[PDB]
Amino acid sequence: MYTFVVRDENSSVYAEVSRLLLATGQWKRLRKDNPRFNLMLGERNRLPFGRLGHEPGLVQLVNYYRGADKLCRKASLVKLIKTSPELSESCTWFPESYVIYPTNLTDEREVFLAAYNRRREGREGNVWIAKSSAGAKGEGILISSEASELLDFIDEQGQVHVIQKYLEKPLLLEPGHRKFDIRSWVLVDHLYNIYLYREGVLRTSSEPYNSANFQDKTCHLTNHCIQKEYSKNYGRYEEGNEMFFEEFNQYLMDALNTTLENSILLQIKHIIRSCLMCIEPAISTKHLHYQSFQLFGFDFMVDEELKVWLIEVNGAPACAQKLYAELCQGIVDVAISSVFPLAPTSIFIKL
Amino acid sequence: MEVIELNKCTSGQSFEVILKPPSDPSLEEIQKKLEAAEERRKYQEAELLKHLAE
Amino acid sequence: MRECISIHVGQAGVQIGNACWELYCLEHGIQPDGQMPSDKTIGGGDDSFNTFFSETGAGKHVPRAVFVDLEPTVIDEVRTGTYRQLFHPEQLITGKEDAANNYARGHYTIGKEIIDLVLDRIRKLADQCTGLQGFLVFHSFGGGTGSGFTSLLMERLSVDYGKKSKLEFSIYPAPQVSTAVVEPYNSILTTHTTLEHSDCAFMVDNEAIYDICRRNLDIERPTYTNLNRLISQIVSSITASLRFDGALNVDLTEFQTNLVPYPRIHFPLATYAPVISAEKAYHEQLSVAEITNACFEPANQMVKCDPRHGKYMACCLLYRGDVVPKDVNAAIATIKTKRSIQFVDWCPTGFKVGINYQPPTVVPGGDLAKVQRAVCMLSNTTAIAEAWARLDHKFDLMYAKRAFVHWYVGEGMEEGEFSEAREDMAALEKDYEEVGVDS
Amino acid sequence: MREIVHIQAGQCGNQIGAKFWEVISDEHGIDPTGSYHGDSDLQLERINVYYNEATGNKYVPRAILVDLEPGTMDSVRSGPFGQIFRPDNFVFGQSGAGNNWAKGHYTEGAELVDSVLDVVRKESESCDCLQGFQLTHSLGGGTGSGMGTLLISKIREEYPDRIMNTFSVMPSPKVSDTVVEPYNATLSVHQLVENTDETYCIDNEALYDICFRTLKLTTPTYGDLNHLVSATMSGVTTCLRFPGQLNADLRKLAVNMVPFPRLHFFMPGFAPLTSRGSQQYRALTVPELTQQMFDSKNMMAACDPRHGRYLTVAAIFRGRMSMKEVDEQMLNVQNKNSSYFVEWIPNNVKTAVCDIPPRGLKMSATFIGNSTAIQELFKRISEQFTAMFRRKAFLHWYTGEGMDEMEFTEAESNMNDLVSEYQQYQDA
């Protein structure tokens, strides 16, 4: 009989994973501070990694990679891409971004203003965005072209923000004239095998894209929470603004002649591989005293030329409603049972 | 890969390799603490003997 | 020549001390008798080994060491053992009853009664020093004596010898060989009161040594003897620079200078290689590059932690045996491209290297194989704070219910000292976190 | 931390005490005349803990024999090893205590107590460094219960900084002499909660159940019961009598076992225990010792440890075996049943190994548990006490000795507080 502890109740994914474990009958759930566990489903912040792997007679595993936050923090991701001898600025799939510390509490201000003299007289669209390392659930973003409107919006809040180059030409979905982001889920096991979930999702805008109306960013930065609020046309096509891969493939064959497999997913597998292999030697638990696995949520943005761009990497993602059972079962199958056996074929693609 | 300060002798040698540059309480206080603790022990024992005498 | 006095406190300090002085004698060719044939200067000298050994007119080489324990049975063995002629009775000090795994009993109750004798015997050794540089103190964290009496001793030493350096070799508690439930209490209590009095402390986690003995020496259930022979090899590597001709870590002050930028952050991580079983018949001898790369393996560390998730402040490589600087530089160059070695911004990314040509000496009939080259890395990394975190958590679990606390208050300690010691530890974890992490 | 002074009081105290000395004398190679005749120096290394040295290489138990009637101690002189005890250490009256705590504690016992303390003092003065005291007695009679606890209080007055340890036999209707046993036991427990550091709760109910259910003995005698106690007392004192790292003296044992001063009542156990008879020469294994020693049906205090949690545990293995296997076995018991050990005391199970096995066994294991389930023992005594007290039945035997009802009310209140304090940590 194996044992585990739950130290993050707010996890919808691992509440389901936990429920799955108990229903196997070969797993027992313990108190959160019982150190005699095989598996830790840990908290989202200040996870006590230093306390793992110090229990004689116990193989221990945790559902997070220590240091994986360098991909998951908005401000840390930019820093890592720029200063890596594997990524560097030889990164053609990530929007130009600059880290902006406020002028009260190092920084790339005269790098955002120094590189700004490129589209000012360059007569190119100078649209930028403003995201927080941890915004108010789904709010705290200001999109504008005025360079002096954003270098003071960050000095209006009490944290560090990242100013990211906005894709003025996003790929349009019809009928609707809308802008969407793609979510793919990635599972990295203890052996550091990269497992992409075959089923991704599309977070669609429930309102026509508007290049004019800028202060109303409700058809921009579509998130399945704010969108439901402001949208007075909530899901005329699909439930909960969720378009799935089988259907998106059909729209691609109808209105763009090509398919999903042809190039877009190709650029996606390259992106996931590039980020995770970059961080491999730093976070791998190859010969550590404890083991790690983690579920990642990569958010993508495609454009008119079917080019894939990278928004964020979510370290603690929630899944789509219809995929929960399948994905969570998959997590148990390759991440947990592979370490703790019992007594086909899988739904993943080993990158 | 700068090697500096190489020093050699019959017993061996030493050097430095740089990959990249940068970018109280008195004796009396102690006596006071030890004596205070001793006093607390004495008081606790006194209370015990008092309880036993009852 | 500047002398060093070694102080061994409690069972762990004494038994480790035994192992170290045995190994010292082997390394310097000193008989249990105390005679040293190779030494042509009779009854005195200013050689490098004289830093640890004084001399009598009859040619006996006497360890500059004091053994202290609150009960007599462990020191008794030294008195009646192989190296009994090495020491004279004044150097071996014993009480009647021990501290019963109680810091308060070792520090306040029993410590108060024996502290003045201990200091006097130490003063006698110091009186025979033309230039005492300081002290090396050996003790466990978990024992009543090793924790309680040591911290009292350290306070008085700071008073009696304000200018002198004080280095620690400390045994961090591990359940697989631990003898008391209250060891986290004793560990935190002693670290708090010792902190401002220690210049550099080398923590050895019993768990790490235990696992190394199982993993690499194929010992099913390691004993204290097995553990201490490995520990003494580490200690010897660290103190070799003080006992032999050389230019690196040549005095106690240099340890602080080279490894301890910030006073409170004075706990260097030791990592040693290679550890090879004396039973293995056909063994292939590891290269400079291999033993050096092994220094960055958590499995070879004296404290299990992950340096990848921390920052270096300093790094010293101490080699013994067939080693030339060219091969060290080649090894470091390769390792730097394949390892996560990040220094803090206000420190040079560099390595201080020392090489002693004499290969490690092993105890005949021991568990360790004779090797041609070995290395001990001393790195000040913030990752060692993992050990403080583990210890502080165990403290919190028990203290929240005040478990066992009455044992300490019964000895005259105040409950507030628990909280005061725990807060200092919380500040210490905070200090490490600032140095090693960026927001 | 060297010498322990042993005191045995009353019939039960002297009977179990006599057997204890028989068993350990055999283990240490001491013959009934006090002469050493062993083949190992392991036997003599810590012999001074329980034995004084006389002239002619004679070893004499540091033991004091106390009773208010001469009968049982006459039996001790006549029994095996009767000659080994110091003749001047026999202290006895003629009146008896009639199974009455008051008589033992306040009247008859009070007259005899000073002469006992004279012998204790004589033994203590001869000690290089006295650890403390151990007392064997029952709680259900008059001498062991009443005078035993009187002695403990007097000794604590003269030696406030020494460890006091008892082997206390708890009464049970299953093996009962008089109806007033719950009175005597409740009164004694109140003394024990205040004046002992460690108390091994030896429940005659559990001993009987073990003899019946486990050992298949139809009609268990005191001889049977005492063999269980004798073996357990040998095991629990192993760490004191032989060279070792863990719980090597009384104070270190207490510091490891007692997280709160009142909660110092231990649940002992022994293994192997096997009925006849395809199981006497059979090779015993480490896993078999470990599983039995932790089994609820094997505890020597009639309570169910599965209903409670362990604050602390001491385990002692004896004989030649694999320490690697001992470690693995102790680990899996904890890892597979972690809920039964409080998480707020990390690593609360401690293991000791001694090379010398007990007589007639190649290997054995002794269990010592501080479990919150021990409340069931005190709760049982409390119910029996209350059943009589609510009607003031049999009280006249006590009030006739100068006691009043208020003292009974206090003892009852104190024992019920003990029960609830054990309950507090069972849910903490």
Ligand SMILES: CC[C@H](/C=C(/C)[C@@H]1C[C@@H](OC)C[C@H](O)C(C)(C)[C@@]2(O)O[C@@H](C[C@@H](OC)[C@H](O)C(=O)O1)C[C@@H](OC)[C@H]2O)CO
């Ligand atoms: C851990 C402390 C400890 C608590 C428990 C629960 C412990 C654990 C284990 O023993 C150490 C059990 C053990 O490993 C077994 C499973 C082989 C087994 O012996 O369990 C019992 C029943 C069990 O209680 C249910 C037992 O009475 C008991 O006390 O178990 C049936 C028996 O049928 C053949 C067999 O199946 C109390 O000190």
Ligand SMILES: C/C(=C\c1csc(C)n1)[C@@H]1C[C@@H]2O[C@@H]2CCC[C@H](C)[C@H](O)[C@@H](C)C(=O)C(C)(C)[C@@H](O)CC(=O)O1
């Ligand atoms: C010999 C014994 C166990 C054993 C040896 S080999 C094996 C597989 N089990 C234990 C000995 C333990 O010291 C305790 C003795 C307890 C004696 C009994 C209470 C009683 O006096 C006696 C009549 C017995 O019941 C047996 C003789 C059957 C006794 O062996 C039972 C027992 O487990 O003894």
Ligand SMILES: Nc1nc2c(ncn2[C@@H]2O[C@H](COP(=O)(O)OP(=O)(O)OP(=O)(O)O)[C@@H](O)[C@H]2O)c(=O)[nH]1
């Ligand atoms: N490595 C090693 N650790 C030891 C040795 N002896 C004891 N320990 C460890 O030290 C801790 C106990 O401290 P001790 O030194 O034995 O106790 P003490 O300093 O004598 O203090 P008291 O006996 O309570 O008066 C436990 O964690 C043991 O695992 C030893 O010889 N080698």
Ligand SMILES: Nc1nc2c(ncn2[C@@H]2O[C@H](COP(=O)(O)OP(=O)(O)O)[C@@H](O)[C@H]2O)c(=O)[nH]1
């Ligand atoms: N286990 C055991 N219990 C005993 C023995 N003799 C008496 N008892 C128990 O002790 C209680 C009676 O106390 P006892 O010692 O006979 O009275 P005392 O002489 O005044 O101390 C009853 O609960 C008996 O069951 C014995 O030899 N072994």
Ligand SMILES: [Ca+2]
């Ligand atoms: Ca000389």
Ligand SMILES: [Ca+2]
């Ligand atoms: Ca009379």
Ligand SMILES: [Ca+2]
């Ligand atoms: Ca008198």
Ligand SMILES: [Mg+2]
């Ligand atoms: Mg000791």
Ligand SMILES: [Mg+2]
């Ligand atoms: Mg009787």
